[PDB]
C-alpha cells in the first residue's frame, strides 16, 4: 500500500513489538510476509506511535524483509543498534 518509513530509537528492552510471518510460517494463508502482531506498552514503537498491529514489515535498516523466513527476520531486527529505519506498509 503506502510505504511508511518509521524512525525508531531502540529501547533498553528492544524495539517493543512482536512479529509473525515468513517463509514456512505464514501469518495469513498464501502470504509469506512479516507482520506486526503486538506492540507492547511503554516500548519504543508504542511511544513513537506510528507502528500498528497488522503492519507488513518491508525492511529494517539495510536488510530486506520481503519473502524471508521467520528466522532471517528475527535476526535482522535483533541485530540492529540504537537507531532503526523501519519500512512498513499499512493494511488495505
Amino acid at each position: 500500500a503506502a510505504i511508511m518509513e518509521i524512525k525508531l530509537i531502540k529501547g533498553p528492552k528492544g524495539l517493543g513489538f512482536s512479529i509473525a510471518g515468513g517463509v514456512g510460517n505464514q501469518h495469513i494463508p498464501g502470504d509469506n510476509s512479516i507482520y506486526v502482531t503486538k506492540i507492547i506498552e511503554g516500548g519504543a514503537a508504542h511511544k513513537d506511535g506510528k507502528l500498528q498491529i497488522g503492519d507488513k514489515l518491508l525492511a529494517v535498516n539495510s536488510v530486506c524483509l520481503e519473502e524471508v523466513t521467520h528466522e532471517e527476520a528475527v535476526t535482522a531486527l535483533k541485530n540492529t543498534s540504537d537507531f532503526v529505519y523501519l519500512k512498513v506498509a499499512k493494511p488495505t
Binding site: 512482536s18 509473525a20 503486538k38 527476520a73
Partner: peptide, 7 residues
C-alpha cells in the same frame, strides 16, 4: 501453529 517473536 505459527511462530511469533519478540523484537
Amino acid at each position: 501453529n505459527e511462530k511469533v517473536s519478540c523484537v
